[PDB]
Amino acid sequence: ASVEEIRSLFKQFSSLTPREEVGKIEDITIPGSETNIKARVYYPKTQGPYGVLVYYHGGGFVLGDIESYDPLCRAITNSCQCVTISVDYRLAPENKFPAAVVDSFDALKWVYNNSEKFNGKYGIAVGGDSAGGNLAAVTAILSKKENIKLKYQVLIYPAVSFDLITKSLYDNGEGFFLTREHIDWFGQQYLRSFADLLDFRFSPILADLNDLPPALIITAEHDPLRDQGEAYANKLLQSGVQVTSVRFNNVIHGFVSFFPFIEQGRDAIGLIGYVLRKVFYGK
Amino acid sequence: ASVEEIRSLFKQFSSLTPREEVGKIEDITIPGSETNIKARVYYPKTQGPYGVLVYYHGGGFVLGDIESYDPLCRAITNSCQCVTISVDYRLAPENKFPAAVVDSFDALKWVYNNSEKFNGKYGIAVGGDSAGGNLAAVTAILSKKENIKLKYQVLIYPAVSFDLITKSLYDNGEGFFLTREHIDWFGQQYLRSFADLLDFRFSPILADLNDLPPALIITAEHDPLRDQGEAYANKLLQSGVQVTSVRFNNVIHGFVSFFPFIEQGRDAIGLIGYVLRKVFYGK
């Protein structure tokens, strides 16, 4: 199947997943530095004012989009009781690194600067799964550099480094949905050149992690990315940042997207909702 | 440090901990088969009807009590928005196995049969930490034998087996608060003879785990009890029971009790509150 065929398939797969009702939905266009960036704003059913979570979908920098992630963003919105803004960042191979990062950061900056539009008085958080967790992490690092003050970062089974050495990569590299072959192929589509491996915007583990927002980092027992996600948590802690690092056992990469039928995914979404209600609202 | 002393010092530590307001508190005395059992009933600030969590404190079957666990049970109450009933089961070495178990089960059975006192229409769950997780697991097994239909079991870093073999026992058995030496000494206070090692009421991993209530099992990366806790989750799964097994990384045994200063502990209590709100209330 072509990359376009698989992109379409994931939208199709979404439509079989029950979409929770939220308060209100609107599509916006965010004026980016290189492009105009589509986003979907989900309001919860409760009264404002709100906290706002800017969410970056996963899909290896190549796949995924606002539509295929719509059911998960609805569930997150209701769990967190916060405005969620799901960002359609530019995809590879058509748009190589650092386009996804440029779009993701541009979107965050704009949301931070315009949070009043959403009655977003309780502050901004970032969040994302896999490649989106990478983007959330990198956006938080870029924010610190620009003195944008984030409340929280939710990193769901993130990819934080180029990896040829973690035990989990070899133990879990076959037979658990996300494989070594996939990972290598995504990396090929996204990267411009070998030199990009030195760039913290590709591997955020490389950055100085001092003064970042506190974090929830979810990993999955059977995920090749598990060890590096837990390493990002350790490096945050070593840098004085509060992080709750939680490994969901018995589940594979992607399990949160499968919340309708993997109950551990529903419970992860429950935990996400808890930490954000905590940080935004004091509960 | 005699038993009495060490009990009373833990009682002091806990006294300086700030206590969350709950809706109201009633001390009751449950007529056990062998003893009168004190229990503290915590109501949340919401109005009912409620689910009820019957909670068994940790402390190795030797330490802890209602007062020293009062701050945790308040936090849990407000998080689950459920009635929490903290049981003062008989302690060792004064009262050897199976005293704690008989009291824990007698308490559960009475709460179950009297759920209307608590406006507990949404049903009954069990929970506990460490030794208390052992008791909650054992109480669930005994319930099934007697057709008592529990909603959920929350096992917080439970001890589920006699153990000389797990990797985490050796990796984590010194220098992380709960030590080899302590685990030994607790066992020596609690058990009558070596024969009790055969008893599922001491090691619930031995039991047939079919048809038990669904479970949240929290383990801690640096706990000697970690592997056996994750084993209990796996055996539940193998036995057709739904379980969300979550390893909290970077923390030691007991971290949930130190929630006021270990934020991962507070987040664990949030997750506990989510799963119980889900199962009781559909939340």
DSSP string spanning B190-239?
A: H-SSGGGGG-TTT-GGGS--TTPPPEEEEEETT-TTHHHHHHHHHHHHHT
- Looking at beta carbons, which residues of chain B come within 8 Å of A275? 267, 270
- Looking at beta carbons, which residues of chain B come within 8 Å of A264? 244-245
- In chain B, alpha helices (H): 3-15, 70-80, 99-113, 131-145, 167-171, 180-190, 226-238, 263-281
The helix/strand/coil state of B29 is: strand
Tokens 């009751």 belong to: B28
The residues with which A54 forms a beta bridge, in sequence order, are: A85, A126
> Whose CA is closest to B100, among B108, B88, B109, B112?
B88
Q: How close A171 gets to chain B, by Cα (Å)?
A: 18
- Chain A residue with minimum CA distance to B241: A263
Q: How close A227 gets to chain B, by Cα (Å)?
A: 11
Residues 201-230 of A with CB under 8 A from B: 214, 216, 230
B239, two tokens = 């036995």
Mutate to test the interface with B, among A81, A223, A232, A246 (most CBs of B within 10 A): A246
- Does the distance separating the beta carbons of A247 and B246 come in below 8 Å? yes
> Whose CA is closest to A72, among A61, A62, A60, A58?
A58
- Contact between residue A241 and residue A45 where contact means Cβ atoms under 8 Å apart: no
Marked catalytic residue, from A79, A86, A104, A130 = A130
Give the C-alpha separation, B283 to B278, whole Å: 4
Q: Is B274 on the interface with A (CB under 8 A)?
A: yes
Give the C-alpha separation, B183 to B197, whole Å: 14
Cα–Cα distances (Å) from A277 to A156, A220, B261, in that order, read 17, 23, 19
Find the helix or strand (DSSP H, E) in which B159 lies: none
Tokens 């406006």 belong to: B119
Query: What is the Cα Rg of chain B in Å?
Result: 17
Query: What is the Cα Rg of chain A in Å?
Result: 17
- Contact between residue B233 and residue B193 where contact means Cβ atoms under 8 Å apart: no
A1-283 belongs to CATH 3.20.20.190: no
Residues 6 or more apart in contact with residue B111 via CB below 8 angstroms: B30, B52, B54, B85, B118, B120, B124
Resolution, in Å, please? 1.9
- Looking at beta carbons, which residues of chain A come within 8 Å of B75? none
Give the C-alpha separation, A69 to A84, whole Å: 12
Q: Is A247 on the interface with B (CB under 8 A)?
A: yes
- Does the distance separating the beta carbons of A250 and B245 come in below 8 Å? yes
Strand-pair category, A52-56 with A83-87: parallel
B269, two tokens = 């209590």
Total H helices, total E strands in chain B: 8, 8
Length of chain B in terms of residues written:
283
Give the C-alpha separation, B280 to B84, whole Å: 13
Residues 6 or more apart in contact with residue B31 via CB below 8 angstroms: B37, B110
The helix/strand/coil state of A263 is: helix
- Contact between residue B277 and residue B154 where contact means Cβ atoms under 8 Å apart: no
Tokens 């939710």 belong to: A154
Find the helix or strand (DSSP H, E) in which A40 lies: strand A36-43
Q: Is A264 on the interface with B (CB under 8 A)?
A: yes
Domain parsing of chain A, residue ranges: 1-283
Closest residue to B246, CB basis, from A243, A246, A273: A246
AA identity, residue B171: D
- Contact between residue B123 and residue B110 where contact means Cβ atoms under 8 Å apart: no
Backbone angles phi, psi at B230, to 5 degrees: -70, -30
Query: Which residues does a chain break follow in chain A (C to N more than 2.5 Å)?
Result: none
Catalytic residues of B: 130, 223, 253
> Whose CA is closest to A158, among A134, A189, A188, A185?
A134
Cα–Cα distances (Å) from A203 to A143, A208, B31, B93, in that order, read 16, 12, 61, 55
- Looking at beta carbons, which residues of chain A come within 8 Å of B263? 214, 242, 244
Q: Is the peptide bond before A93 cis (omega within 30 degrees of 0)?
A: yes
Give the C-alpha separation, B106 to B145, whole Å: 14
- Contact between residue A78 and residue A45 where contact means Cβ atoms under 8 Å apart: yes
- Contact between residue B152 and residue B215 where contact means Cβ atoms under 8 Å apart: yes
Give the C-alpha separation, A68 to B131, whole Å: 45
Total H helices, total E strands in chain A: 8, 8
Burial class (CB in 10 A: 0-12, 13-18, 19+), B206: middle
Strand-pair category, A243-248 with A215-220: parallel
- Does the distance separating the beta carbons of B273 and A271 come in below 8 Å? no
Q: Is A280 on the interface with B (CB under 8 A)?
A: no
A130 flagged as catalytic: yes
> Whose CA is closest to B278, among A270, A255, A264?
A270
Q: What number of other Cβ atoms are within 10 A of residue A201's Cβ?
A: 22
CA B65 vs. chain centroid, Å, equals 12
Residues 6 or more apart in contact with residue A264 via CB below 8 angstroms: A248, A250, A251, A255, B244, B245
A47, two tokens = 């009264």
- Looking at beta carbons, which residues of chain A come within 8 Å of B248? 244-246
CA A195 vs. chain centroid, Å, equals 24
